[PDB]
């Protein structure tokens, strides 16, 4: 959208999507950014045990119908000073994702359903605390799971 | 305004639908809207009140989302929902009392309080929900300039005007002629009287006429038209026009001969009714013209012939009346009636907090002085404050 | 008669529920009924009026379906919805004024206008919605 | 309506900007809009006229696009542009004359001609361009129900009402008292006269009063208030109230003592001016109340004392006048004034083609009868037809 | 002429748009036109003035182009732009004062100064820009022989003609009859008087008539028509027709009976108005015919009956007047009015530099003598000099 | 001040140009300026109001940039644009009402409100846009000390001064001589009267003279000069100089012999007109000298010779008048006139919020007392507040 890149300043409690949407007026990318700003788990006891649940937009996979609407908005988007080969490459790389609408709506239906059926067999609390060591995720594995 | 109705509609539904033991599929589409509301309202601060004795309250929203993982809603979920709902209900109560209390001569249809000017942004536009009540439907239709209609049961379209008119008079006040009327609420009671009982009128017939102009154009009105106006049918003493002396009125009642009730819109006769009583209909009108006449009875028994001599002393005065009561009507502008309590809520908020008289509304919210001079700026202010009163009447009982 | 109430109930709800910025899950069950209504009403032509000074109007329905892919309804969806709703509201207004004006001594409970006699088929029965008034 | 203004704005700019020899960068953003207009208007057929003597014309659009490859526009491009522009200007001229001639009692703000009902689709919505004129700005603001203002130079807010009032009268007409007035255009000339010159009034002071109600609420009006109304200051003979006899009026002019000019809005005094002449201002008003009084001069030279005897024959009658001229005012509704020619264009189109009298407008477009009964349906029709007249006045000189 | 308007339009826009700190995309299409102007005007020399006291100035253009490489215009660019603009503004000021001062009987629509004859080449044709002002639009439309219209507020269409006419007269001047009039600016005040008050006229009715021929055909004129001409309603002494003796005029004012105002075009009645006052409209006319009549009042009170005896001494003379004021009108030819200042600019330039009287225009630029004999060669000269005055009024305030 | 006009010009253009369905190339240069405006205004907080009843409002700007790339602007872009535009329009409305309400004796041309003192930094200088309106052009030209001109239609250059002068008088008041005048708005009506009609003056000629000094130098004025001042031509009774007694004035009107109208600048005769009526021109002047004279008619009919005896009782008094009406004029300083509404906007803002009387402007914004003593500090304050009123009149209708 022609905007200057942000300097983050770590000390704020505001994530880059959370500053970005207050700086971006689209009604299509802003829907997606405001989803991701406040998707978090919802703490409720079910039969005694506390559980960390998704909202129902992730749960039935309907939220991907907005991410792909926000992605093919970034595909009809001319960039003001990017070189054209890297721009055409990044627009077609977005179109690699935005043409798998149903294939990823159904994938985040399946992922959430497996999380559902295995969350029922939890018997201790599902406490969310930031652990010390982290399980490293490769985004290459996410691109593999997508495509 | 749309987001304020949306906040109140979700809080009403979440007091109604989110109960103990109910199935989750009954509330699965409401919890998502309530979570969207929490996500939108977090991080924002508001300030309500500051006029009259309405206290300044600061509002800060820091709430967690509600759980989406139950099958039947247990009492934990109901109690945390009741906490969040009670805080938001107190917030929207104070926003509505901050908005009904303010007014502007310049553009009254715009929000005047700081909280509702802050809620009128597109950041808060994702709060928005269905707009199903009549006042928010007519708000959204008049925000796009389409035709609206408010359905009123006995609308207060007439200002209080109890007066008379002497077509024939003298300082003796023993041979008078003219009309008397009571315009009150939705009811016109008119009575033309002659003391001579048309003993010297041509063809023993005296023509009366009473023209009531309205302030707003009523549409599809059911009207009970009865003869024999009951209030102007007993003896009374009445002050004169200048208030100097008083004159006596001892009526005997003839029936109204040749009743013609016409419903005028821009001077054109829309509906007319000739000697038909009971329930009548008037489809489109802003002026009501009652044309009744007093005819001297040509055959009289000896009990009647002693009442009306040919000479001067008339101890019994001929009087002919009509009664016209608008039972229900559809009006494009806002009014008050016997069904809603919105004007009562507006006056209760303006009188409870000792509010100074502003530039638009009459002192003390006098509805007679408000419908006597019903300007379009006052119309816009009245519609805005009635819409906010309807919103608060949804939340606060 | 049932389908006429159903048309009017969906048009009332779609003026109420389909607004700018509202969440899609609030309107996810209404857009399916409104699309069923569009699918049923396409290809059909109607003729209203013809008695007194009520003018003869011809009605032709050729509309596209509404999108089912937003998360929050933006103003494009609201404007195309307002167009389709205004055409259907004008249609049902003229059908109701064509039906209130007619009467019959023989069997008055039956529909008298040509448009409501055409709507009383089972082709139009999938328009039907809740009957709550 | 928006697309009709857009067609006319592009045709005006393309007569202005597309000239011979001009640089292409001056017209690079106009040729794209004109090509979008050609692309939108092709394949469509229209039919204008059909009422009165306005002839039925059929319009078919089959045009090629304009070239986008010159550096300086040569005369070939100018000639093909002038051809396409002349055809579209004739089209929009006949659409505007087809729209100004029609009216409706039901909803006058809607387009009435077939061509403008066809242009009100979203297929033609890509024609749309900037809306910079005052009438299309107020059209777009009142299409969303916001506050508007039309700035008028000497507005024709007053209907023509030349009449009088006799507070004291007799059939001899030799000792009269009361006011006379001329309300015309933007000018009120009022004059209260007494024949006795307050020789029996209490404290030798006779109070006059003249209340002019307006039809629409004027805002921020500059008003020249002068004393000594010039028209009612010379001798004249005047017919009576019933028109039976005539009475003579031989005025001598005193100055107005204790002038109080009040500007009432809904009965509330907004502005007041006590014995101040010259240019005054009235910020918000719909009623003008002039309260001047005639005081008998207590010291008179022998040339003055012969004019006003104590007895009955008054050959010189005391007369006191005021003049109030609204120079410029901002009104939310449409009016006519001395600056625009839009009412003249509307009447010229309605009189040129011999148009029958419809349901809304007065016969012959009588502005006195149009502002005497200025109903909101007539207001909507007048605003729509004035907007179309402004569009045609942009194209057709 | 087109390139002179183009120079002035670019200099006006470059004083407006090229400011400090503004974004380059706001001025990206203006700097290219201004650079095209610099590229065209370099290498050329001009010579302005040389008539009267207008000094001879030599103009040489050697300027560098403006930079096209900023994002926000800094103050360096603004200062070098202000230098180049001030030199070009002084040049176009002296070219406009050299063109308004000259005239020709042979073909006045052609440029007369040496500088504007040099600018009328195709070498300078790439200077050309949009032609959006009313005078250059009507210049370009009349250069192709199409219909134009200048919209005037109170046009000076009437020459000053204050005179009278005695239909019945004698050297005693005690029983006179006829009309008096004042034609001034846009206002006709006419008054027919009879000293006998039609005491021997047939049916006690005296017919008056006043025919005003115009010089140019007005179109779509809003006209305030009032009765009772105010200037001819007080007593005055007036010289005779030969100027020998003076006669006295003591008017009392009757109202005008049977007013017929006709608007003639080529002898054909276009519009007619019978006893209608207030604001009227006249769509197409070049002659105004006022036909009012004086009727003796058949019923008179004793205060009136002493004014009009049957015998000869009439100390009170019956007088009946009308007033007709053209508020705004569209005329195809150029005129002067109360809104523009173009005639004032032309006369200021011709009087400031002590210019000799030429062959076309009247001495001292007498507008009464210019509109009295308004020949087409004088029309062409007046339109050319008014167009150049509009150009200079754009640049020089 | 420049950036305030720039904010208002972009908001006006973005209400005009950014509409639904318009092509992107029509608005491609406006969206970049509006994004530069958003980028500049973010992170800044303002505070408006705080004097009288003008409420204190705090302004915080946190908006996203309009960078979405469209070919035709859809309704999403229009709605988010309308939100941002409505917030900025409310901001600039309150800044303009905060600036028109304040004044300073020390340096009035400087900004007085806190918001406009904060906007006068170079951080906000990149907001700046074209300065095309007349008031901001004259603001920018007088900020560099160059010549300006405001074009007024009927300027209010004359303070209200209705008075007289008795060159010959006595306590009997039966043989008077001198001038009377009305200076109001743009109109001078003067009338010299002699009761003897120059029966003992040398050569039967009485010379009158009336000198009107102006407050600011008018330039290129079109002036309607008519004879026979209408207001001083009917009989009236007038209080004396000390206000003790009243004297009678019964005029008969002679024509003005030997009219000499001179237009003085610094005592030098710029223009002179000898016995020429109708429309005249005055190119540069600040004093108007009217020199008319009353000549006794040497030949009189018997109806005239009875009016003017040689002895003392004069029942008919000779009176000679002129009328001078400035239709349009160019003045370097700001004024008020019948065309603009800027003074009305300033007085409406100062009267709506109940503002105390400050050090510079007269109480109640009396224009007569403001142009009576029109000091240069009051001139600077008036020009600044009129410029801000023009800005707000662009945004707020
Ligand atoms: Zn004017």
Automatic annotation (TrEMBL), chain A:
Record's subcellular location: Virion
Protein modification: Sumoylated with SUMO1 and SUMO2. Sumoylation of viral proteins seems to have a positive role on viral replication.
Family affiliation: Belongs to the rotavirus VP2 family.
Cited function: Inner capsid protein that self-assembles to form an icosahedral capsid with a T=2 symmetry, which consists of 120 copies of VP2, with channels at each of its five-fold vertices. This capsid constitutes the innermost concentric layer of the viral mature particle. It encapsidates the polymerase VP1, the capping enzyme VP3 and the genomic dsRNA, thereby defining the core.
Swiss-Prot/TrEMBL domain comment: The N-terminus binds RNA. It is necessary for encapsidation of VP1 and VP3. The N-termini of 10 VP2 molecules form a cylindrical hub underneath each 5-fold axis of the inner capsid.
Subunit comment: Homodecamer; each decamer is made up of two conformers of VP2, called VP2A and VP2B. Interacts with a VP1-VP3 complex. Interacts with the intermediate capsid protein VP6. Interacts with NSP5. Interacts (via N-terminus) with NSP2.
Name by which UniProt lists this protein: Inner capsid protein VP2
Organism: Rotavirus A
Recorded name of the encoding gene: VP2
Entire protein: shown range: 442 to 588 of 882
Automatic annotation (TrEMBL), chains B, D, E, F:
Binding site for Ca(2+): 266, 286
Membership in a protein family: Belongs to the rotavirus VP6 family.
Role played: Intermediate capsid protein that self assembles to form an icosahedral capsid with a T=13 symmetry, which consists of 230 trimers of VP6, with channels at each of its five-fold vertices. This capsid constitutes the middle concentric layer of the viral mature particle. The innermost VP2 capsid and the intermediate VP6 capsid remain intact following cell entry to protect the dsRNA from degradation and to prevent unfavorable antiviral responses in the host cell during all the replication cycle of the virus.
Subunit structure: Homotrimer. Interacts with the inner capsid protein VP2. Interacts with the outer capsid glycoprotein VP7. Interacts with the outer capsid protein VP5*.
Main location: virion
Annotated region described as Interaction with the inner capsid protein VP2, given as residue ranges: 62-73
Note: The VP6 trimer contains a zinc ion located at the center of the molecule. The zinc ion is not essential for either trimerization or transcription activity of the DLP. Zinc-depleted VP6 has an increased sensitivity to proteases.
Protein name: Intermediate capsid protein VP6
TrEMBL record, chain C:
Subcellular compartments: Virion
Source species, domain of life: Viruses
Chain segments carrying region Interaction with the inner capsid protein VP2: 62-73
PTM comment, free text: Sumoylated with SUMO1 and SUMO2. Sumoylation of viral proteins seems to have a positive role on viral replication.
Homology family: Belongs to the rotavirus VP6 family.
Function: Intermediate capsid protein that self assembles to form an icosahedral capsid with a T=13 symmetry, which consists of 230 trimers of VP6, with channels at each of its five-fold vertices. This capsid constitutes the middle concentric layer of the viral mature particle. The innermost VP2 capsid and the intermediate VP6 capsid remain intact following cell entry to protect the dsRNA from degradation and to prevent unfavorable antiviral responses in the host cell during all the replication cycle of the virus.
Subunit composition and interactions: Homotrimer. Interacts with the inner capsid protein VP2. Interacts with the outer capsid glycoprotein VP7. Interacts with the outer capsid protein VP5*.
Note in the entry: The VP6 trimer contains a zinc ion located at the center of the molecule. The zinc ion is not essential for either trimerization or transcription activity of the DLP. Zinc-depleted VP6 has an increased sensitivity to proteases.
Identification of the protein by name: Intermediate capsid protein VP6
Organism, scientific name: Rotavirus A
């Amino acid at each position: 959208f022609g905007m200057q890149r942000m300097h983050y300043r770590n000390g704020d409690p505001q994530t880059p999507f959370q500053i970005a949407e207050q700086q971006i007026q689209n009604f299509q990318v802003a829907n997606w950014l405001h989803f991701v700003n406040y998707n978090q788990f919802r703490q409720v006891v079910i039969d005694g045990v506390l559980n960390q649940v998704l909202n129902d937009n992730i749960r039935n996979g309907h939220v991907v119908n907005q991410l792909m609407e926000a992605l093919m908005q970034l595909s009809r988007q001319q960039f003001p000073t990017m070189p054209v080969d890297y721009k055409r490459s990044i627009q077609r790389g977005i179109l690699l994702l935005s043409n798998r609408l149903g294939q990823l709506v159904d994938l985040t239906r399946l992922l959430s359903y497996n999380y559902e059926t295995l969350m029922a067999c939890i018997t201790m609390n599902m406490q969310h605390v930031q652990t010390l060591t982290t399980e490293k995720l490769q985004l290459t594995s996410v691109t593999s799971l997508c495509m | 305004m749309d987001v304020l109705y949306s906040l109140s509609k979700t809080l009403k539904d979440a007091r109604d639908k989110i109960v103990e033991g109910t199935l989750y599929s009954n509330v699965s589409d409401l919890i998502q809207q309530f979570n969207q509301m929490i996500i939108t309202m977090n991080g924002n601060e508001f300030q309500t009140g500051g006029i009259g004795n309405l206290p300044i309250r600061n509002w800060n929203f820091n709430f967690g989302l509600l759980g989406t993982t139950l099958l039947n809603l247990d009492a934990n979920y109901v109690e945390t929902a009741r906490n969040t709902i009670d805080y938001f209900v107190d917030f929207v109560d104070n926003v509505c009392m901050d908005e009904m209390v303010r007014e502007s001569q310049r553009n009254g249809i715009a929000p005047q309080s700081d909280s509702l000017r802050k809620l009128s942004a597109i950041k808060f536009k994702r709060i928005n929900f269905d707009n199903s009540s009549e006042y928010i439907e007519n708000w959204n239709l008049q925000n796009r300039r389409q035709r609206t209609g408010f359905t009123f049961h006995k609308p207060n379209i007439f200002p209080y005007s109890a007066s008379f008119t002497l077509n024939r008079s003298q300082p003796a006040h023993d041979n008078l002629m003219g009309t008397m009327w009571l315009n009150a609420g939705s009811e016109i009671q008119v009575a033309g009287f002659d003391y001579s009982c048309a003993i010297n009128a041509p063809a023993n017939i005296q023509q009366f006429e009473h023209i009531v102009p309205l302030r707003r154009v009523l549409t599809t009105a059911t009207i009970t038209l009865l003869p024999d106006a009951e209030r102007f049918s007993f003896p009374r003493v009445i002050n004169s026009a200048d208030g100097a002396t008083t004159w006596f009125f001892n009526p005997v009642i003839l029936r109204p001969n040749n009743v013609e009730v016409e419903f005028l819109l821009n001077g054109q006769i829309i509906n007319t009714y000739q000697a038909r009583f009971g329930t009548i209909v008037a489809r489109n009108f802003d002026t009501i013209r009652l044309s009744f006449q007093l005819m001297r009875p040509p055959n009289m028994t000896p009990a009647v012939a002693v009442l009306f001599p040919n000479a001067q002393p008339f101890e019994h005065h001929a009087t002919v009346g009509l009664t016209l009561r608008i039972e229900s009507a559809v009006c494009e502008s806002v009014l008050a009636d016997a069904s809603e309590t919105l004007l009562a809520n507006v006056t209760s908020v303006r009188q409870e907090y000792a509010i100074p008289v502003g530039p638009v509304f009459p002192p003390g919210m006098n509805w007679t002085d408000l419908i006597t001079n019903y300007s379009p700026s006052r119309e816009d202010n009245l519609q805005r404050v009635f819409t906010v009163a309807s919103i608060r009447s949804m939340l606060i009982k």
